[PDB]
C-alpha cells in the first residue's frame, strides 16, 4: 500500500472548455419563411447556436 494522502493533480475533461452558458429569460416563438433544410427526400431541422 501507498498510505500517503496524495493529491490528484492529473485530471481530464472531454467536454467543452467553457464556464459561461447562455440562457433564455423570456421565451418566444416567431413565424419564419424557412422551416428546414431538404435533401432529396430527406429533411433536416434548423438548430441554432
Amino acid at each position: 500500500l501507498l498510505h500517503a494522502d496524495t493529491p490528484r493533480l492529473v485530471t481530464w475533461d472531454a467536454g467543452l472548455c467553457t464556464s459561461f452558458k447562455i440562457v433564455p429569460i423570456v421565451p418566444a416563438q416567431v413565424p419564419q419563411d424557412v422551416l428546414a433544410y431538404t435533401f432529396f427526400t430527406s429533411s433536416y431541422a434548423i438548430q441554432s447556436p
Partner: protein, 49 residues
C-alpha cells in the same frame, strides 16, 4: 337518350361551364413557408413547402 347531348344547346352549355371554371378559381394565393434545399440539381434554392 341518357348518353348524348343536344348540339343546339352546346354553346349555351359551354358558356356556363366556363363560368364555373372562373367562379371555382376565385381565390387568393396563400403564402406558406419554404425549406432551403440542397439537392444537387436545385442546390441552394428555397422550395415552397
Amino acid at each position: 337518350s341518357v348518353r348524348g347531348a343536344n348540339p343546339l344547346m352546346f354553346r349555351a352549355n359551354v358558356l356556363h361551364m366556363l363560368l364555373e371554371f372562373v367562379l371555382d378559381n376565385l381565390y387568393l394565393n396563400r403564402h406558406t413557408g419554404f425549406s432551403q434545399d440542397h439537392t444537387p440539381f436545385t442546390e441552394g434554392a428555397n422550395l415552397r413547402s
